[PDB]
Enzyme design. Structure first.
Site, PDB file in Angstrom:
ATOM      1  N   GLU A 279     -68.297  24.570  22.442  1.00  0.00           N
ATOM      2  CA  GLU A 279     -69.206  25.343  21.586  1.00  0.00           C
ATOM      3  C   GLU A 279     -70.521  25.689  22.305  1.00  0.00           C
ATOM      4  O   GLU A 279     -70.938  26.832  22.305  1.00  0.00           O
ATOM      5  CB  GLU A 279     -69.462  24.668  20.236  1.00  0.00           C
ATOM      6  CG  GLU A 279     -68.260  24.624  19.273  1.00  0.00           C
ATOM      7  CD  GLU A 279     -67.854  25.970  18.672  1.00  0.00           C
ATOM      8  OE1 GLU A 279     -68.564  26.984  18.868  1.00  0.00           O
ATOM      9  OE2 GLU A 279     -66.814  26.010  17.976  1.00  0.00           O
TER      10      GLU A 279
ATOM     11  N   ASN B 211     -72.913  36.287  15.881  1.00  0.00           N
ATOM     12  CA  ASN B 211     -71.617  36.696  15.357  1.00  0.00           C
ATOM     13  C   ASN B 211     -71.668  38.165  14.978  1.00  0.00           C
ATOM     14  O   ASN B 211     -72.765  38.714  14.833  1.00  0.00           O
ATOM     15  CB  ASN B 211     -71.218  35.819  14.198  1.00  0.00           C
ATOM     16  CG  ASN B 211     -71.039  34.391  14.614  1.00  0.00           C
ATOM     17  OD1 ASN B 211     -70.051  34.048  15.260  1.00  0.00           O
ATOM     18  ND2 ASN B 211     -71.999  33.545  14.273  1.00  0.00           N
TER      19      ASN B 211
ATOM     20  N   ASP C 206     -70.807  39.673  12.204  1.00  0.00           N
ATOM     21  CA  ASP C 206     -71.333  39.835  10.858  1.00  0.00           C
ATOM     22  C   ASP C 206     -72.859  39.744  10.842  1.00  0.00           C
ATOM     23  O   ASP C 206     -73.479  39.914   9.790  1.00  0.00           O
ATOM     24  CB  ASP C 206     -70.704  38.809   9.897  1.00  0.00           C
ATOM     25  CG  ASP C 206     -70.898  37.376  10.358  1.00  0.00           C
ATOM     26  OD1 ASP C 206     -72.028  36.876  10.246  1.00  0.00           O
ATOM     27  OD2 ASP C 206     -69.927  36.743  10.839  1.00  0.00           O
TER      28      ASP C 206
ATOM     29  N   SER D 116     -74.670  36.984  11.448  1.00  0.00           N
ATOM     30  CA  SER D 116     -75.141  35.614  11.378  1.00  0.00           C
ATOM     31  C   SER D 116     -75.225  35.051  12.793  1.00  0.00           C
ATOM     32  O   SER D 116     -74.670  35.638  13.734  1.00  0.00           O
ATOM     33  CB  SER D 116     -74.242  34.759  10.479  1.00  0.00           C
ATOM     34  OG  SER D 116     -72.940  34.638  11.006  1.00  0.00           O
TER      35      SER D 116
ATOM     36  N   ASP E 238     -74.963  31.483  15.424  1.00  0.00           N
ATOM     37  CA  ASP E 238     -74.499  30.115  15.677  1.00  0.00           C
ATOM     38  C   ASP E 238     -75.560  29.333  16.460  1.00  0.00           C
ATOM     39  O   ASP E 238     -76.132  29.844  17.439  1.00  0.00           O
ATOM     40  CB  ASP E 238     -73.205  30.145  16.490  1.00  0.00           C
ATOM     41  CG  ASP E 238     -71.974  30.483  15.654  1.00  0.00           C
ATOM     42  OD1 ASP E 238     -72.074  30.667  14.426  1.00  0.00           O
ATOM     43  OD2 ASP E 238     -70.875  30.556  16.232  1.00  0.00           O
TER      44      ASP E 238
ATOM     45  N   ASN F  97     -73.279  27.690  12.012  1.00  0.00           N
ATOM     46  CA  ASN F  97     -73.478  29.088  11.601  1.00  0.00           C
ATOM     47  C   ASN F  97     -74.501  29.221  10.478  1.00  0.00           C
ATOM     48  O   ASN F  97     -74.555  28.362   9.604  1.00  0.00           O
ATOM     49  CB  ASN F  97     -72.103  29.594  11.136  1.00  0.00           C
ATOM     50  CG  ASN F  97     -72.041  31.082  10.953  1.00  0.00           C
ATOM     51  OD1 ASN F  97     -72.000  31.555   9.827  1.00  0.00           O
ATOM     52  ND2 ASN F  97     -72.005  31.830  12.045  1.00  0.00           N
TER      53      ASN F  97
ATOM     54  N   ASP G   6     -65.969  19.670   4.262  1.00  0.00           N
ATOM     55  CA  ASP G   6     -65.785  20.919   3.488  1.00  0.00           C
ATOM     56  C   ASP G   6     -64.356  21.292   3.063  1.00  0.00           C
ATOM     57  O   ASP G   6     -64.132  22.361   2.475  1.00  0.00           O
ATOM     58  CB  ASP G   6     -66.348  22.061   4.344  1.00  0.00           C
ATOM     59  CG  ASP G   6     -66.539  23.335   3.578  1.00  0.00           C
ATOM     60  OD1 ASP G   6     -67.283  23.323   2.553  1.00  0.00           O
ATOM     61  OD2 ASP G   6     -65.948  24.354   4.017  1.00  0.00           O
TER      62      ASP G   6
END
Length: 129
Positions: free
Chosen positions: A35, A46, A48, A50, A52, A59, A101
């Site tokens: 990562e 990202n 979209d 957003s 990281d 995110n 989650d």
């Protein structure tokens, strides 16, 4: 801060990640590796819009506030900034919520793609733990 392989494992282990939700220490070190490459200050945009953040690339759409992600949540109730410090606390704490989650460590696409089902014990081979 760029952690060493075993130094990150130590910090991770001290913050209760070792076998958290059943994922042994090697999984978290492998996921960090791919990562951020063990760098706390890693960010990545990202598509979209957003962003990281941090050692585990958490995110902003869901998990932190950066004030630049229309429509997002801040489910770890932190500024995304917190995820970039040398002190990994915020990062580990917010990882704990993510991995809880429902989807486990699959929440990290790099872990699914690169760590899942590999000899993850390699990542902690030879560390004083």
């Amino acid at each position: 801060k760029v952690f060493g392989r075993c130094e990150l494992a130590a910090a991770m282990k001290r913050h209760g990640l070792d076998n958290y939700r059943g994922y042994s220490l090697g999984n978290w070190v492998c996921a960090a590796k791919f990562e951020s490459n063990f760098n706390t200050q890693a960010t990545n945009r990202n598509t979209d819009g957003s962003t990281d953040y941090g050692i585990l690339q958490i995110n902003s759409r869901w998990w932190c506030n950066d004030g630049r992600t229309p429509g997002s949540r801040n489910l770890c109730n932190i500024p995304c900034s917190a995820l970039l410090s040398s002190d990994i606390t915020a990062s580990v704490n917010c990882a704990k919520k993510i991995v809880s989650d429902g989807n486990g460590m699959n929440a990290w696409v790099a872990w699914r793609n690169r760590c899942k089902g590999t000899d993850v014990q390699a990542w902690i081979r030879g560390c004083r733990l």
